[PDB]
Amino acid sequence: IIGEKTFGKGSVQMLLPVNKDEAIKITTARYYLPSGRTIQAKGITPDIVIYPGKVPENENKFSLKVTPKMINDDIQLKTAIDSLKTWSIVDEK
Amino acid sequence: IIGEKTFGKGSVQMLLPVNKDEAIKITTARYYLPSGRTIQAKGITPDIVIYPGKVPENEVTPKMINDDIQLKTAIDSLKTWSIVDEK
């Protein structure tokens, strides 16, 4: 899991008939992860934190006058690729 | 292998004794990797390319990880290895 902390919305609601005049929507259940932790109080904390932006380049304005090169405009996407590249290396056993 | 492409110094020189008055140094052998490829022509191309610098943010080795983005990547590549080994 790469990126930032998520929003944390782990509730589900349901239409409850208060007779015929009124109806309420309230949380009828909450979500729990395979680890047992709940999702609403905290959300998901990723294994690798990387804030968005462009990929650095010591000569990024010297060079200045299907997912290639776009990886350079997205530092978060390039890191997930980097974790795949080490994963594919580890599976070479 | 994390970082940049290396320099590529895979040559070996040797002193050829022209008696006692002269000696020449010339490359007598080259280095070859376990894959058979030579070193000087290409060097080492890393698996993960990363230029050095600071890690962007959003506002004994702690804090330096932020001042060394290459080190943060090498740790991150270890962190996925520890996940795969969870079998």
Q: With contact defined as beta carbons under 8 Å apart, do A80 and A2 qualify?
A: yes
Instruction: Outline where DSSP puts E strands in chain A.
Output: 2-3, 11-18, 22-30, 48-49
Q: Return the amino acid letter for A52.
A: P
Torsion angles phi and psi, residue B11, rounded to 5: -110, 155
Helix (H, G, I), strand (E, B) or coil at A63: coil
Question: CA B55, CA B70: separation in Å to the nearest integer?
Answer: 9
User: Which of A51, A31, A29, A26 minimizes the C-alpha distance to A41?
Assistant: A31
Q: With contact defined as beta carbons under 8 Å apart, do A39 and A5 qualify?
A: no
Angle among Cα A49, A55, A61 to the nearest 5 degrees reads 155
Cα distances from B81 to residues A2, A20, A91, B50, B84, in angstroms, run 14, 59, 9, 19, 5
Question: CA B19, CA B23: separation in Å to the nearest integer?
Answer: 8
Number of Cβ atoms within 10 Å of the Cβ of A3: 17
Question: CA B79, CA B48: separation in Å to the nearest integer?
Answer: 14
Number of Cβ atoms within 10 Å of the Cβ of A76: 17
Q: Which residues in A lie closer than 8 A to residue B58 (C-beta atoms)? A: 4, 51
Which tokens sit at B80?
């996925």
Torsion angles phi and psi, residue B75, rounded to 5: -65, -40
Half-sphere exposure of A90 (CA within 13 A, CB side): 17
Which tokens sit at A7?
């929003």
- Cβ contact (<8 Å) for A83 and B84? no
Q: With contact defined as beta carbons under 8 Å apart, do B48 and B73 qualify?
A: yes
Question: CA B35, CA B51: separation in Å to the nearest integer?
Answer: 26
Of A51, A53, A82, the CB nearest to B48: A82
Which tokens sit at A40?
């609403």
Question: CA B63, CA B45: separation in Å to the nearest integer?
Answer: 28
- Cβ contact (<8 Å) for A56 and B58? no
Q: Which residues in A lie closer than 8 A to residue B72 (C-beta atoms)? A: none
This structure's resolution (angstroms)?
Answer: 3.7
- Cβ contact (<8 Å) for B79 and A48? yes
Technique used to solve these coordinates:
X-ray
Indicate the angle between helix axes A75-90 and B69-84, nearest 10 degrees. Answer: 50
Residue indicated by tokens 């050829």: B16
Half-sphere exposure of B68 (CA within 13 A, CB side): 13
- Cβ contact (<8 Å) for A56 and B77? no
Which tokens sit at A49?
């934190």
Q: Which one of A86, A88, A91 would you mutate to disrupt binding with B, by most B Cβ within 10 Å of its Cβ?
A: A86
Number of Cβ atoms within 10 Å of the Cβ of A15: 9
User: Which of B66, B82, B74 minimizes the C-alpha distance to B50?
Assistant: B74
Q: Is B81 exposed, middle or buried (0-12, 13-18, 19+ CB in 10 A)?
A: middle
Question: CA B12, CA B39: separation in Å to the nearest integer?
Answer: 11
Q: Which residues in B lie closer than 8 A to residue A85 (C-beta atoms)? A: 47-48
